Amino acid sequence: DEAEASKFVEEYDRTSQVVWNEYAEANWNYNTNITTETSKILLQKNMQIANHTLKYGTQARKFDVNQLQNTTIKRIIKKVQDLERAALPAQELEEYNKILLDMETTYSVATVCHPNGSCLQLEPDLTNVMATSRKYEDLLWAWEGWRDKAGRAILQFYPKYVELINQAARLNGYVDAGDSWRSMYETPSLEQDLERLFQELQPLYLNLHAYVRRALHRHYGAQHINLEGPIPAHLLGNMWAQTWSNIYDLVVPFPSAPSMDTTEAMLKQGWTPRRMFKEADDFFTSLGLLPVPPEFWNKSMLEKPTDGREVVCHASAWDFYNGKDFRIKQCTTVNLEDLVVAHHEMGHIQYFMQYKDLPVALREGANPGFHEAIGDVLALSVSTPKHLHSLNLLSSDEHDINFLMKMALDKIAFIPFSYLVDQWRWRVFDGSITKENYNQEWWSLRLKYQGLCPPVPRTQGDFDPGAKFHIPSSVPYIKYFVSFIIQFQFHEALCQAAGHTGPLHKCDIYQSKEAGQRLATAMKLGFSRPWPEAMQLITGQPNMSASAMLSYFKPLLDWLRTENELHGEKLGWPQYNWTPNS
Ligand SMILES: *[C@@H]1O[C@H](CO[C@@H]2O[C@@H](C)[C@@H](O)[C@@H](O)[C@@H]2O)[C@@H](O[C@@H]2O[C@H](CO)[C@@H](O[C@@H]3O[C@H](CO)[C@@H](O)[C@H](O)[C@@H]3O)[C@H](O)[C@H]2NC(C)=O)[C@H](O)[C@H]1NC(C)=O
Ligand SMILES: C[C@H](CS)C(=O)N1CCC[C@H]1C(=O)O
Ligand SMILES: [Cl-]
Ligand SMILES: [Cl-]
Ligand SMILES: [Zn+2]
């Protein structure tokens, strides 16, 4: 009956609030202080939430979903029918929980040491080396070292992780874990749509790639860069070469039009991690969106502890499922990179606050890409020279191309990377890639999509995917690719709503109530409606589209084409088998 389904959903919501709140606190503690005690209590509260999930999941499966009138109730019960890991038998569930914890801990505590003495952590030590070093061998030491210590140490867990996560997926009606992850977008054409979006960004990426390769040839020498081949993976200023902004100094289009060092300016003007988040909060409220509760400032970990405690430094935002307690956990360094990250995380909080009155089962983004996009949209306006000057962090066509380049190194370079991560994982989950070929197929995709090669030939036992946080942490990655496409669509739509005219990249939406209103109406929908509805609320149309991102970067595309043609660059990497001779 229709009445029994409504009652079930009401009972689910009530009991879920209590249990999910309890789990959130226990998960917070392990992430903020990795010990043996906190690892145990997390696993005990893990079985508690699994107990609830199993109880209500089993009940939900007794309801005939498609023979149910109300669409909101129908949708909730359908989601509760997916038990996820709680579908595993007790022994497999215990093993699976143990593996995830083991992989995450291994990643978190891995260090790279000189035999002399000094041991380096990923953050900030190895990250800093990757960002600042302009010495080929020193970059190699950190690049290889991190893979040797973190990547290699994840390999022993991964095949069993794959087995158990696929099993849980099959027990919930999917064919494998990748199938289950993709289903979050509720879009049959997902794979085709993403491929077309990626293809639309080829002219821009290939031109950026060719230009950067030429600049690296200039700095690192003709003997170490093949102008028709892939770029060695350790030279892009980032451990994973996923964003390239840290090598801006090597690639600046107009060196005679330099801008202020914002990181130096932040440190100069005494910018605290707490000020960085206060500024993000101001931007949201300027748009007419919600301020963070007083409780947020009291309970968030906005900086790496000087206590010397082992933490998960990876930046994340937290919903405690009571509509009052929201937190950010971040090991914040004072720079521009983390100022954008601060807006990114505050975007998650805004989303939490906006949909807090919905049933717990519908308290997520329209799709995972939406949750990731919100903060980045505001950060786009923040990053403009106009806005950076109003923050006293900065003091012509040449400055224009320079700024666009800086943006391109982050936003454009990230496209092929964010695309490839789950292209790899989907093929691991569906069985196309076995443990014999994990690493080799990872590098095939790094070549195919990003046009990169490893500086050092990989050996048996290498598991370079393991050296990227989201792999041992089992966090789906395709959302970041969606985010980067759609955030430019949102920027474009909000800029139109704010009455901005002229080049899209010149837009700053600060204080625009019309912009804030479009985001608010979409964000309040939570997961209650198919994502194209939220897309239509923001942009006036229902599709994902790369046209906004292309429009944003159009002046840079023109510049890159002229510059690359001038030097006769080959677009792409026709000599695709080239690897460093060293
Ligand atoms: C299908 O059912 C949904 C959800 O129903 C809700 O959940 C059920 C399990 C039961 O507990 C119901 O009692 C409960 O309503 C219905 O959506 C709901 O619609 C009403 C409007 O009729 C919304 O109420 C609003 O509440 C705000 C409070 O801030 C007021 O300002 C508004 O004026 C308005 O009264 C309610 O929020 C909404 N619930 C959800 C979860 O979206 C829906 O009406 C129903 N559809 C059909 C076709 O019957
Ligand atoms: C910090 C966020 C998690 S909320 C993240 O993992 N990001 C943000 C963009 C890409 C990806 C990454 O760091 O690899
Ligand atoms: Cl790698
Ligand atoms: Cl995702
Ligand atoms: Zn995020």
Give the C-alpha distances (Å, rounded to integers) separating 278 from 85, 284, 378: 38, 10, 14
Active-site entry in 12, 56, 480, 552? 480
User: CA 280: distance to chain centroid?
Assistant: 18
- Protein residue with least CA distance to atom 2, ligand 2: 315
How far does the centroid of ligand 3 lie from the alpha carbon of residue 464, in Å? 5
* Residue 135 to residue 234: CA distance in whole angstroms: 11
* Residue 461 to residue 306: CA distance in whole angstroms: 35
Helices (H), 229-335: 248-251, 262-268, 273-286, 294-299
565 in active site? no
Residue 288 contacts residue 516 (beta carbons within 8 Å): yes
**CA within 13 Å, CB half, 405:** 25
Helix (H, G, I), strand (E, B) or coil at 577: coil
Pairing of strands 452-453, 231-232: parallel
Placement of tokens 């709503």 in the chain: 497
How far does the centroid of ligand 4 lie from the alpha carbon of residue 427, in Å? 15
Give the C-alpha distances (Å, rounded to integers) separating 448 from 70, 396, 560, 564: 47, 37, 21, 21
Q: Which residues line ligand 1 (CB under 6 A)?
A: 6, 9-10, 70, 72-73, 358-359
What residues are neighbours of ligand 3 (ion), with CB under 5 Å? 464
User: CA 130: distance to chain centroid?
Assistant: 19
Taking the CA atoms of 569, 572, 577 and 580 in sequence, report the sign of the dihedral they define: positive
Ligand 2, residues 107, 318, 470: which to mutate, most atoms within 8 A of Cβ?
A: 470
* Residue 242 dihedral angles phi and psi, to the nearest 5°: -85, -30
* Residue 329 to residue 535: CA distance in whole angstroms: 29
Domain boundaries, the chain: 1-582
Taking the CA atoms of 347, 349, 352 and 354 in sequence, report the sign of the dihedral they define: negative
* Residue 563 dihedral angles phi and psi, to the nearest 5°: -60, -45
Amino acid type, 253:
P
From its phi and psi, is residue 149 left (phi > 0), alpha (psi between -120 and 50) or beta? Answer: alpha
Give the C-alpha distances (Å, rounded to integers) separating 362 from 74, 293, 357, 526: 12, 22, 10, 6
Helix (H, G, I), strand (E, B) or coil at 252: coil
Nearest bound ligand to the CA of residue 143: 3
Nearest bound ligand to the CA of residue 476: 4
Tokens describing residue 160: 């069993």
Pairing of strands 316-319, 326-329: antiparallel
* Residue 230 to residue 207: CA distance in whole angstroms: 13
Taking the CA atoms of 331, 334, 338 and 344 in sequence, report the sign of the dihedral they define: positive
Helix axes 547-566, 478-497, angle to 10 degrees: 100
* Residue 237 dihedral angles phi and psi, to the nearest 5°: 85, 5
Helix (H, G, I), strand (E, B) or coil at 328: strand
For the CA atoms of 236, 241, 245, 248, what is the dihedral angle to 10 degrees? 10
Helix (H, G, I), strand (E, B) or coil at 358: coil
Give the C-alpha distances (Å, rounded to integers) separating 53 from 5, 61, 436, 470: 17, 12, 35, 24
Task: Say yes or no: CB of residue 475 within 6 Å of ligand 2.
Answer: no
* Residue 171 to residue 93: CA distance in whole angstroms: 12
**Helix, strand, coil tally for the chain in percent (to 5):** 60, 5, 35
Query: How many other β-carbons are positioned within 10 Å of the β-carbon of residue 299?
Result: 15
Active-site entry in 52, 343, 348, 505? 348
DSSP states along 44-95: HHHHHHHHHHHHHHHHHTTS-GGG-S-HHHHHHHHHHT--GGGGS-HHHHHH
Residue 92 contacts residue 160 (beta carbons within 8 Å): no
Residue 436 contacts residue 155 (beta carbons within 8 Å): no
Please give the number of the atom of ligand 2 that sits closest to the Cα of 344.
4
Q: Which is nearest to 548 in space by CA: 492, 495, 464, 499? A: 492
Residue 195 contacts residue 547 (beta carbons within 8 Å): no
Ligand 1, residues 70, 76, 363: which to mutate, most atoms within 8 A of Cβ?
A: 70
* Residue 45 dihedral angles phi and psi, to the nearest 5°: -75, -20
* Residue 407 to residue 248: CA distance in whole angstroms: 10
DSSP secondary structure letter of residue 417: H
Residue 549 contacts residue 488 (beta carbons within 8 Å): yes
* Residue 287 to residue 515: CA distance in whole angstroms: 7
Placement of tokens 């700024």 in the chain: 403
Q: Which is nearest to 170 in space by CA: 470, 475, 471, 430? A: 430
Tokens describing residue 505: 């990249």
In the PDB record, what is the listed experimental method?
X-ray
Placement of tokens 């609030």 in the chain: 17
Helix (H, G, I), strand (E, B) or coil at 404: helix
Tokens describing residue 232: 């060695």
314 in active site? yes
Nearest bound ligand to the CA of residue 360: 1
Placement of tokens 């942490």 in the chain: 473
174 in active site? no
When computed from its CA atoms, the radius of gyration of the chain, rounded to whole angstroms, is: 24
Tokens describing residue 353: 């606050």
* Residue 543 to residue 516: CA distance in whole angstroms: 21
Tokens describing residue 69: 């009138």
Placement of tokens 């079985």 in the chain: 47
